[PDB]
């Protein structure tokens, strides 16, 4: 399963399911393709029906020239889900998600090539 994948717009199709796993909702970015790249707000422009599927509220559609919908996961390198402090325990959950967060960024790079 590719972290980046563009779906045929298919006219007024509200919902679209994504197969790739993502750590956080904010990482997933949905853009409009066909005339120019358009970024959409997470909560106003679209909504997550479930974890697997996403539904576009405004049904942008083929109108204005946009012909395809592109959904890709971008994991921020600056923003880290877990950070390590000198005190405190080093829980196994934190060390694992730290591993998979940086693994996700590399996985995005390989799929693009």
């Amino acid at each position: 399963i590719k972290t980046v994948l563009t779906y045929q717009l298919d006219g007024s199709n509200r919902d679209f399911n994504i197969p790739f796993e993502y750590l956080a909702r904010k990482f997933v970015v949905v853009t409009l393709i066909g005339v120019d790249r358009k970024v959409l707000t997470i909560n106003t422009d679209y909504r997550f029906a479930t974890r697997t599927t996403i539904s576009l509220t405004k049904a942008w559609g083929p109108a204005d020239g946009y012909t395809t919908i592109e959904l890709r996961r971008v994991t921020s390198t600056t923003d880290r889900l877990v950070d390590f402090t000198d005190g405190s325990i080093l829980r196994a959950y934190d060390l694992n998600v730290a591993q998979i967060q940086t693994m996700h960024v590399a996985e995005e790079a390989r799929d693009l090539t």
Binding site: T85, D86, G87, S88, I89, L90, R91, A92, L95
Partner: protein
């Protein structure tokens, strides 16, 4: 013994049931930190999800004139610190 010059090679701090702390060493010119955080990789008590604080001795290199370098310990990281000893080693030729 004011007479003579002491070149101290290192020092150590004994801690019991204590967490992290930073042992600043400040000569006339430069400064050093020597943070002691955890047990040390490959040690039984380092295992994950465990509270990580314990008894031990920390030996840090402090080098200088024994009269111009200041060694001071401080910590913020929300973990008890009980210092049950201190020491140092030096050469001390008398002149």
């Amino acid at each position: 013994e004011d007479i003579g010059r002491l070149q101290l090679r290192r020092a150590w701090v004994n801690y019991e049931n204590s967490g992290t702390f930073d042992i600043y060493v400040e000569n006339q010119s430069s400064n050093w930190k020597y943070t002691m955080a955890g047990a040390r990789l490959g040690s039984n008590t380092l295992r994950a999800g465990r509270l990580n604080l314990g008894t031990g001795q920390y030996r840090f290199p402090v080098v200088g004139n024994a009269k111009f370098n200041t060694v001071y310990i401080l910590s913020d990281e929300t973990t008890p610190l009980n210092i049950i000893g201190c020491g140092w080693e030096g050469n001390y030729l008398r002149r």
